[PDB]
Design a protein around this ligand. Structure first.
Ligand SMILES: COc1ccccc1Oc1cccc(CN2CCC3(CC2)C(=O)NCN3CCc2ccccc2)c1
Lengths: 225, 232, 288, 56, 338
């Protein structure tokens, strides 16, 4: 053996530590990870409330599925130095406020808020770290958007837009504009859901999206990519 | 940290008892546990040991088969079920905690013990000093000899010095022959050469009076010395 | 004719042995040597590779038996028959177990999260191997070498009173080798196909195609084998008797054996070689 | 507003500009001398025998 | 006037550049031209530390050169006996997003931190037998990138808010806030005398700070991209910077300018970690190409290469006695090379 008594006991302690690490790793792998991003005031807090400093953690359980939502909106640092820590998350919940087609950013009027959302979406969807990572696209503030389109038309946000100013068609146009920012339409897939303040099926939509993502992941793992 | 133990009493020979050791103030699950006897006027002898998570159980040769040691981690308690008691087991039992990793200090805290009376290849560790006079303010050296070299090839000499004050639970002084335990004044020092070791007290006071024991920890019959008593 | 058939069978046996060796060795080398058995599917795939290798290990001795008389002896005839039969049983059981695993992964994703681990897969694989050994225990006791017409042959001797055990061991290869496994095999993949059709993904079409490939491959490999088994059992029961019938059943026996074990070389290219993860592992190995 | 930032930057630049600098020759010579003096005590540069290598 | 202030700043920069050029009588390349090359260095993986189930972001050797701490995204801080591969402790962190770890020189404490902007300091030697969080230093408004222990009571951290801080642990307060960087500070290294420390940030600048006083003494530029790794020369009169421009740079404190750039055409990936051997001769840099390159510090020639990590080599350290070289990569493994 060539091992002392206390050396053998230390080996046993290390084995117990290994067993605990394996148990916690299995528990963690049983979980689902969502990275929640939004262009500032994008209704992100509203959805955070409905499912239940720096990085904010949220745990909830829905239909025997344990979620872990990470909010990084308060980082206010170089995103490129910590966005690789979230490589491998199950999904990315991107919140976009539909009421920002009119409002312009406080920092200069030359550069629009929905354009900020589109730029952030382009950065995150086309990021090298998120290539096969699915995006669940929440389009919040749909009631305010529906009310406001009557007064100001969608042409301000999209000069090239040529269509009816009805709520449904404009919402479809904005959704299409967001999904045409996806360079790789084969490795990753984008789920779009419209929400409001009184919506009560957002958790169900997230559950369906994550279930589909899990099915795809374990189809890749089972040899049926 | 407390290690209060319960049980004991007068038992007729051939009977059975359950000695209980309640632990509070520290993590039980991460700590291995030992039972150490104390005869009414004699030294200490290791009885049984269980590791963290009840992985390994060891017993002394003289107590094999009859005793069974167990632990309850959720209840934070230690049990010793004793069967076929004879007059050789009449002792003051001591519950000892011991953690094992690199740089750890085994045999930190010894419980107060329970009194138990019954109606009527191991390393030999020898301290021939038995009793030596002491005067306050002087320096004293206590020697302990080993049957085989306690220095393992990894470089760790496995020797432990314990001080038992009059009417007190044993207290760890030196672990692995040169390392001072927590809360022990720096006047205590330990040295050795693999087989013969010394423990030096630079300046004693009335607090240092007591009986000193040396333990080996190479193999696992854990054997103590006869002990050396200090009298002012 | 007889010499032509002997050389013909020897040639196909040799090529099948070589191809199965390459495929199963590549699977094993990727799984246990170059990489780790990360997932439960890796455990099932390694077990299937071992099953295919065990099945094909008996091919060289059969080729020698075609070339010349049996010389290896009684005990190795026992172990060769065990190799063949344990390989057959383990391969079918692992195919069924992979069908169940994919059914869990696709139909019940949340439940399969908590019921699909490496330990459970290893336990089920050990159970499958033990079941295969138990199933081939009855067949080994009758496989005895004997001198017929001056030629040593290793075969399942059945005396006039033991003919009942031959027919029973033939139906066991049918109801326990095909009927029970393929009922689970069929049910699991039909429900996978139904689930994949009603799904929003780009991987759905590839998975549908691969599921259909698996189903048709397994059926064409294993159905003619067991059909000619059933017909042979009926002939032994004297229900279908005839010299021309006997010759036709022997020829069908040979051709359906070839179509049957071809699986030991097709199963790798269907379960591992096609599929993105194994291609990525192979590319990583090639780069290094 | 930005005037205070500019003043602070100018003061810091002045504080950085008043240091005493020795030539690259002397600094490089010092680095070389330190490397040469302690070259015998670097296990990575000069591999030790397996007897005193703790990682065998 | 703002224009006058900008003109004065430009004039001061011109004067600094002129002084630096005047002091550059020769270069480290020609001075060490006649020195014998180190030779082919081949280091074998003596130990492989398994147990982490996520990407390892941090690692720090202890003073005794046997116990080392490792941080990875699975939310655990594992303390390893390197001599015999063992796990002494497995501290479960509150925030799984750990990007830095530190081992105190005494060994009684270990610090971690990350996207929580909190430096959590844990006590290893406790009467309860379990590792307990001693302190939770908060006040940074950005992600913590590196924390180094001065002693058992003071710790120095660098954050993504373009600042560094000195904390006294026994009150959990920011004694001195070091400001002056424009981008996020990603690495800091303490001098052997623990009186100055160099911090490299994302504005391609490395600033030398006096710990006691609290202002930047020297600012070193030259990198074309963010500085992700810094390490003091053992002498304390130089340091090395790794960047995303696939180059390492050696800056001299007394010469107040660069001395050499270690680069090669085959290397395009950035440097994540940089460390020196215990002679100043070998510069070990972890690269994103799943490799760790060992350069000769005096001669820009590449001394050796360490391969064996299947993902990006994120952390890299050298023991105080220089016996071994620990490398931790994103493949959840630590390899001890010798
Ligand atoms: C001496 O070689 C072996 C001895 C024992 C088992 C496998 C040895 O290797 C080989 C290698 C290939 C082919 C055979 C020959 N076959 C003959 C038919 C067979 C299996 C072995 C048998 O025996 N009894 C019934 N059984 C299957 C009957 C059947 C039914 C439908 C289609 C095809 C076959 C043996």
């Amino acid at each position: 053996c060539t091992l002392s008594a206390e050396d053998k006991a230390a080996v046993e302690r290390s084995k117990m530590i290994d067993r605990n690490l394996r148990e916690d790793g299995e528990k963690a792998a049983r979980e689902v990870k969502l990275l929640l991003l939004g262009a500032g005031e994008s209704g992100k807090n509203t959805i955070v409330k409905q499912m239940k400093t720096g990085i904010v953690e949220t745990h909830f359980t829905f239909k025997d599925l344990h979620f872990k939502m990470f909010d990084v909106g308060a980082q206010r640092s170089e995103r490129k130095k910590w966005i690789h820590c979230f490589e491998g998350v199950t999904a990315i919940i991107f919140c976009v406020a539909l009421s920002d087609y009119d409002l312009v950013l406080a920092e200069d009027e030359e550069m629009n808020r929905m354009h900020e959302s589109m730029k952030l979406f382009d950065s995150i969807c086309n990021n090298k770290w998120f290539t096969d990572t699915s995006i669940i696209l929440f389009l919040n503030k749909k009631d305010l958007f529906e009310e406001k389109i009557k007064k100001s038309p969608l042409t301000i946000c999209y000069p090239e837009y040529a269509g009816s100013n009805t709520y449904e068609e404009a919402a479809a146009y904005i959704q299409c504009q967001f999904e045409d920012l996806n360079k790789r339409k084969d490795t990753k897939e984008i789920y779009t859901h419209f929400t409001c303040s009184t919506d009560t099926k957002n958790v169900q939509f997230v559950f369906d999206a994550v279930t589909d993502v899990i099915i795809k992941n374990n189809l890749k793992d089972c040899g049926l990519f | 940290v407390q290690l209060v133990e319960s049980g004991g009493g007068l038992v007729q020979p051939g009977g059975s008892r359950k000695l209980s050791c309640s632990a509070s103030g520290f993590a039980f699950s991460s700590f291995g546990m030992h039972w150490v006897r104390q005869a009414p006027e004699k030294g200490l002898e290791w009885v049984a040991y269980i590791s963290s998570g009840s992985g390994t159980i060891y017993y002394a040769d003289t107590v094999k088969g009859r005793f069974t040691i167990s632990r309850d981690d959720p209840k934070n308690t230690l049990f010793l079920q004793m069967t076929s008691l004879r007059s050789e087991d009449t002792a003051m039992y001591y519950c000892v905690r011991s953690i094992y990793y690199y740089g750890s200090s085994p045999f930190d805290f010894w419980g107060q013990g329970t009194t138990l009376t019954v109606s009527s290849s191991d390393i030999v560790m020898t301290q021939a000093t038995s009793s030596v006079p002491v005067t306050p303010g002087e320096s004293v050296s206590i020697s302990c000899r080993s049957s085989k070299s306690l220095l393992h090839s990894n470089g760790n000499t496995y020797l432990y010095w314990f001080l038992q004050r009059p009417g007190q639970s044993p207290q760890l002084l030196i672990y692995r022959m040169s390392n001072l335990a927590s809360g022990v004044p720096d006047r205590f020092s330990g040295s050795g050469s693999g087989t013969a070791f010394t423990l030096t007290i630079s300046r004693l006071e009335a607090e240092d009076v007591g009986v000193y024991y040396c333990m080996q920890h190479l193999e696992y019959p854990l054997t103590f010395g006869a002990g050396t008593k200090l009298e002012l | 004719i007889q010499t032509n058939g002997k050389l013909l069978l020897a040639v196909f046996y040799c090529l099948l042995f070589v191809f199965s060796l390459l495929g199963n060795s590549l699977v094993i080398l990727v799984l246990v040597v170059c990489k780790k058995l990360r997932s439960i599917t890796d455990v099932y795939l390694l077990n299937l590779a071992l099953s295919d290798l065990l099945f094909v290990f008996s091919f060289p001795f059969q080729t020698y038996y075609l070339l010349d008389q049996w010389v290896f002896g009684t005990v190795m005839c026992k172990v060769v028959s065990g190799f063949y039969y344990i390989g057959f049983y383990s391969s079918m059981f692992f195919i069924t177990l992979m069908s169940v695993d994919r059914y869990l992964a696709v139909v019940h994703a949340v439940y399969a999260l908590k019921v699909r681990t490496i330990r459970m897969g290893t336990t089920l694989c050990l159970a499958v191997w033990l079941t295969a050994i138990m199933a081939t225990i009855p067949l080994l006791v009758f496989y005895q070498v004997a001198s017929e017409d001056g030629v040593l042959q290793c075969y399942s001797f059945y005396n006039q009173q033991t003919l009942k055990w031959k027919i029973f061991t033939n139906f066991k290869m049918n109801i326990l080798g095909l009927l029970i496994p393929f009922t689970i095999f069929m049910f699991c993949y039909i429900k996978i196909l139904h689930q994949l059709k009603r799904c929003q993904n780009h991987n759905k079409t590839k998975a549908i195609r691969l599921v259909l490939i698996v189903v048709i491959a397994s059926l064409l490999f294993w159905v003619p084998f067991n059909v000619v088994l059933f017909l042979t059992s009926l002939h032994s029961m004297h229900i279908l008797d005839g010299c021309s019938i006997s010759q036709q059943l022997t020829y069908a026996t040979h051709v359906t054996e070839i179509i049957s074990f071809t699986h030991c070389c097709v199963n790798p290219v269907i379960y591992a070689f096609v599929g993105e993860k194994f291609k990525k592992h192979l590319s990583e190995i090639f780069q290094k | 507003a930005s005037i205070a930032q500019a003043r602070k930057l100018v003061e810091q630049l002045k504080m950085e500009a008043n240091i005493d600098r020795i030539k690259v020759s002397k600094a490089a010579a010092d680095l070389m001398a330190y490397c040469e003096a302690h070259a015998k005590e670097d296990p990575l540069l000069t591999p030790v025998p397996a007897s005193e290598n703790p990682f065998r | 006037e703002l224009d006058q202030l900008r003109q004065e700043a430009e004039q001061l920069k011109n004067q600094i550049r002129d002084a630096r050029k005047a002091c550059a009588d020769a270069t480290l390349s020609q001075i060490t031209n006649n020195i014998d090359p180190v030779g082919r260095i081949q280091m074998r993986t003596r130990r492989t530390l398994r147990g982490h189930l996520a990407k390892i972001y941090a690692m720090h050797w202890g003073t005794d050169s046997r116990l080392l701490v490792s941080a990875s995204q699975d939310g655990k801080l594992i303390i390893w006996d390197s001599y015999t591969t063992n796990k002494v402790h497995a501290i479960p962190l509150r925030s799984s997003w750990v990007m830095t770890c530190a081992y105190a020189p005494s060994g009684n404490y270990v610090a971690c931190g990350g996207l929580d902007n909190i430096c959590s300091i844990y006590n290893l030697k406790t009467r309860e037998g379990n590792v307990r969080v001693s302190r939770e230093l908060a006040g940074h408004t950005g992600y913590l990138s590196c924390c180094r222990f001065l002693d058992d009571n003071q710790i120095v951290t660098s954050s993504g808010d373009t600042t560094c801080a000195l904390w006294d642990i026994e009150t959990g307060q920011q004694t001195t806030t070091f400001t002056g960087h424009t981008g996020d500070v990603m690495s800091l290294s303490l001098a052997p005398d623990t009186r100055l420390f160099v911090s490299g940030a994302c504005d391609a600048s490395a600033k030398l700070w006096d710990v006691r006083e609290g202002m930047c003494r020297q600012t070193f530029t030259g990198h074309e991209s963010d500085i992700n790794a810094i390490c003091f020369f053992p002498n304390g009169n130089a340091f090395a910077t790794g960047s995303d421009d696939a180059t390492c740079r050696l800056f001299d404190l007394r010469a107040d300018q660069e001395l050499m750039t270690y680069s090669h055409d085959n290397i395009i990936c950035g440097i994540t970690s940089v460390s020196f051997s215990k002679s100043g001769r070998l510069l070990l840099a972890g690269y994103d190409d799943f490799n760790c390159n060992v350069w000769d510090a005096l001669k820009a020639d590449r001394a050796g290469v360490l391969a064996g990590h299947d993902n990006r080599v994120s952390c890299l350290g050298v023991t105080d006695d220089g016996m071994a070289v620990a490398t931790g990569s994103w493949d959840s493994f630590l390899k001890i090379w010798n």
